[PDB]
Amino acid sequence: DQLNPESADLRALAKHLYDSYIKSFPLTKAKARAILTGKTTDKSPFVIYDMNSLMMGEDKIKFKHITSKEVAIRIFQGCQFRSVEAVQEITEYAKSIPGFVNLDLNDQVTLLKYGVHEIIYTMLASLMNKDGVLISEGQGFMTREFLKSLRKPFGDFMEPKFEFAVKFNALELDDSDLAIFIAVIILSGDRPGLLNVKPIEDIQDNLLQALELQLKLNHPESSQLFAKLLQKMTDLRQIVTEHVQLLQVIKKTETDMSLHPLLQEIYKDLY
C-alpha cells in the first residue's frame, strides 16, 4: 500500500492530497484563474496600483492591525499578516500528508521551517498574472508595477516572485497537480538538521511516484512535465536565499519593524 504502491494506490494518494488541499487553502488556482480572467459572477477585485488606491482599498482587504507609516512599510506589514495565515494553512495541509504526523515531532518542525516559504512562493504563482497579484482571498488585486516601484529594498521582495511565477505558470499545473508537488517539497530529506531522514525519504518516494503518474495522466500531451517541475524545486531555494538576505537588510536598516513571532521562529537559525 504505502510501502509498495501500484497505480491505484498512487491515484488514491493523489486524490487524498487534492481533497485536503481544497480543505486547507481557501483560494485555489481554479478560483483565482476564474477571477483573473473575468470568468466569474463575483464582483471584481479592488485594484491597488498606487498610494491613493491602497488608501481607498484598505477598506476592502482582510488585514488586522493596531492603527500612519509609509506605503512600503504598510505593504510589508500586510505581507506579514498574509504570510502568517499562509503558514497556518500549510501546516494544516502538512498534517494531512500520510505519514507526516508519525515522524519525530522535531523533524515535522524542521520540514515546515524550511518548506513553508517555498510553498508560499509556489502557490503565489496561482494568484498571479504578468500584471499583478490577487490578495485577501481574491478581494484585491495589487499591480506588479506598484509593488516593483516600492522604495529600496522593498521592491526587491516583489519582482523576483513575479519572474518565477510567469515561468512557473507556463507549466499549466492545476490544483490536483499542485497538491502533490507541494507535498513533495515538504517531504524533502535534505533539510538541515533532520534527525531521521529515512522515513521522510520513504514518504517522498511515494509522493514523487504519485506526482509523476498524475502528470502523465492529467497532462498526457505535456511530455517531461515531471522533470521541468523537479528543477523548479531548486529555483525556489534561490528565491528563499535572496529573500532572507533582504530581510537581514531590513532588520538592520528599519529599526521600528519587527517580524511576527511565528516568522521570527521560522527564520531563526534557518540554514
Binding site: 504526523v101 515531532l105 521551517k113 521562529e265
Partner: peptide, 10 residues
C-alpha cells in the same frame, strides 16, 4: 519553535 509546535498540536 513554540508556535510551530502549538500549530502542529492544534
Amino acid at each position: 519553535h513554540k508556535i510551530l509546535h502549538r500549530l502542529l498540536q492544534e
